[PDB]
Amino acid sequence: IVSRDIARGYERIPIPCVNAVDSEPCPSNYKYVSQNCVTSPMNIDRNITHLQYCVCIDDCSSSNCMCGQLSMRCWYDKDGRLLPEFNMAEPPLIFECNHACSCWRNCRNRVVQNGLRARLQLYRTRDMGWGVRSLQDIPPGTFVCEYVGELISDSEADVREEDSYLFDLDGEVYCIDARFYGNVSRFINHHCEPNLVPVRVFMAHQDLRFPRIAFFSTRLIEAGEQLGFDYGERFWDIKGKLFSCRCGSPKCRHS
Ligand SMILES: COc1cc2c(NC3CCN(Cc4ccccc4)CC3)nc(NCCCN(C)C)nc2cc1OCCCCCN
Ligand SMILES: [Zn+2]
Ligand SMILES: [Zn+2]
Ligand SMILES: [Zn+2]
Ligand SMILES: [Zn+2]
């Protein structure tokens, strides 16, 4: 227990850090943030009259809900989990209800905006590196965490040496750099057969240039299992030569 909570009380549940390998302290060469931040002007469209919203009089579980229509359909179930019909291989954009909607703060189309649910833990792996794992089981289709970091422009990313903490959002494109500013996600390692899938979501605003990145369980995750996701082509076409993937997956396409 080298740290009770790396979020310093910002998440709904603490995220302790333990080291059972070497004697290295908890990471501290970065600033933890639970929400995306910017280090410059960023003209995100927060015009409330530009938001598309719903006028549901129920708990938004009907076929009429405008917000679900935008998402093709609401994909959350009564518990807040993704429906089996959800395409993990090619996720759709999810538009959750927002403050312009007529519904209540507890309608069914609100999951990612409710914050952390699963008890996670940061820990030192054998590789002398760091990783994240669940201290409880996570049913499939559950929202685990968001990839939070510093929001930056395309070119801005091009002039950064350390680029291992970037996440492309995909006109002009933007990125999230978790190197200097980030949440528990910056510590999640790559894996070829990932139990976490990133989903572009929209909540308080609907500026398509800035989707927020939500990670969902692509299958059951057992207490103690290590979270992971597919970093992607761009990553490996750059780091593939500095080293080969040590994910240990029978289907590894990078080692
Ligand atoms: C490490 O993996 C990634 C590298 C990226 C990168 N790297 C560049 C390489 C060249 N140096 C060059 C340089 C460095 C220093 C000084 C001058 C020039 C600058 C950083 N650039 C951009 N977007 C940049 C815009 C490209 N644009 C032309 C479209 N996105 C990236 C997304 C990555 O992971 C994605 C998966 C997530 C992994 C999460 N852990
Ligand atoms: Zn609705
Ligand atoms: Zn709603
Ligand atoms: Zn709505
Ligand atoms: Zn691999």
Residue for token digits 């938004």?
Answer: 60
Residue 246 is assigned to a ligand binding site: yes
Which residues partner with 150 through β-bridges?
37, 177
246 lines ligand 1 (CB under 6 A): no
Amino acid in position 145: C
Give the helix/strand (H/E) hosting 124: strand 120-124
Q: 133-142 b/e with 16+ CB inside 10 Å = b? A: bbeeebebbb
166 lines ligand 1 (CB under 6 A): yes
Phi first, then psi: give them for residue 193, nearest 5 degrees: -125, 70
Which residues partner with 196 through β-bridges?
217
Elucidated via: X-ray
Amino acid in position 95: F
172 lines ligand 1 (CB under 6 A): no
Amino acid in position 26: C
The ligand that comes nearest to the alpha carbon of residue 52 is 4
Burial of 28 (0-12, 13-18, 19+ CB in 10 A): exposed
Q: Find the angle CA(150)-CA(208)-CA(156) to the nearest 5 degrees.
A: 35
Question: In this structure, which residues have their CB less than 5 angstroms from ion ligand 3?
Answer: 60, 97, 101, 103, 107, 109
Residue 184 · residue 34 · CB < 8 Å: no
Residue 189 is assigned to a ligand binding site: yes
Residue for token digits 């649910």?
Answer: 117
Residue 97 is assigned to a ligand binding site: yes
Which residues partner with 215 through β-bridges?
145, 198
CA of 214 to the centre of ligand 5 (A): 21
d(CA 51, CA 66): 11
Burial of 128 (0-12, 13-18, 19+ CB in 10 A): exposed
Helices vs. strands in the chain: H and E counts, helices first: 3, 13
CA of 58 to the centre of ligand 3 (A): 8
Tell which atom from ligand 1 comes closest to the C-alpha of 163: 1
Residue 177 · residue 149 · CB < 8 Å: yes
- Ligand 1, atom 40, residue with closest C-alpha: 165
The full DSSP string for 187-251 is: GPEE-SS-SEEEEEEESS---TT--EEEEEESS-B-TTPBPEE---HHHHHHHTTT-------TT
SS3 state at 233:
helix
Domains of the chain by start residue, with CATH: 1-255 (2.170.270.10)
Q: Are strands 212-217 and 94-95 parallel, antiparallel or unpaired?
A: unpaired
d(CA 74, CA 82): 9
